[PDB]
Amino acid sequence: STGSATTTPIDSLDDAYITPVQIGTPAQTLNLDFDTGSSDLWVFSSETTASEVDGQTIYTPSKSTTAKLLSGATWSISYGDGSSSSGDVYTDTVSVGGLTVTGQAVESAKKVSSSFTEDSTIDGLLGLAFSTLNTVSPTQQKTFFDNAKASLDSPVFTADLGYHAPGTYNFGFIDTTAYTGSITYTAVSTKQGFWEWTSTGYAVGSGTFKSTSIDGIADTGTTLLYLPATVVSAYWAQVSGAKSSSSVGGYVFPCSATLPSFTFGVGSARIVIPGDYIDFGPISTGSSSCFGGIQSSAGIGINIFGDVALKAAFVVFNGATTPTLGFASK
């Protein structure tokens, strides 16, 4: 089997992407944030504290003839951005782009943090990291991909995120029309539960490539590109007037600037992030100070190849017995 679904930016900045997901019988379609950095499929629901729901579409398990309460199971998650959610668990039928899993754990939120409430466009998350990170207790549950894997034509999924445009998540096949050149595959460590890999270096604009190992995670659920402070300083030094602002929370730059590209290495291959991908617009409405899309990972504890990086590539998440990651230009 295979599946193919379009993923759509939630706003004009590509702050996140939403993908429609069918849950239950009859189907209830919710728009979920596919997150290769976590491993829980959780949804706003009829059980979510009413004051914490503000415009989201909810899953109502009592209206699904295939929903079953997973007795005694609870979940609770905290994300890198400080947001969080928790609740109980159902199993139900879940379909993505024509690919159906029966008995998928659907984690129903009883509580969500303010950042989730305040984002009306995201109805929940669909985790695509390794199932070892799943938070369901006392019996850990499998991700949608893990459950689908054996049925797929090939045990892979691909992320093809657009810049200011829709893109695609495919399951079970590689669309050879969706990228240019070849896909370069690179080793993955699953030791921390992430799609963790080592970039071979970087360049800023038309500058020379610096060969240096950068361990980090391919994370579709993180907006920006978080890299070591040395790398990030080298990038912003090429933008007149750019500075790190403690009050704003990172590098900002004059909105009048033209940003240089940023290149990262994948083995001997190179992925080029155009300068415009690195512009996240005014820090507040009407400001001429703009927020940068490349930020320091210092104090995160891990480098993160988030959407800024991934949307410059066609990315293969290869879930073979020994997982690997593939990157192509597009």
From Swiss-Prot:
It comes from the Eukaryota. It catalyses: Hydrolysis of proteins with specificity similar to that of pepsin A, prefers hydrophobic residues at P1 and P1', but does not cleave 14-Ala-|-Leu-15 in the B chain of insulin or Z-Glu-Tyr. Clots milk. Disulfide bonds join C255-C290. The active site is at D35, S199. Residues 17-328 form the Peptidase A1 domain. One of its GO terms (biological process) is proteolysis. Keywords: Aspartyl protease, Disulfide bond, Hydrolase, Protease, Signal, Zymogen. Its EC number is 3.4.23.22. GO terms for molecular function: aspartic-type endopeptidase activity. Belongs to the peptidase A1 family. This is Endothiapepsin. The chain holds residues 90 to 419 of 419 of the full protein.
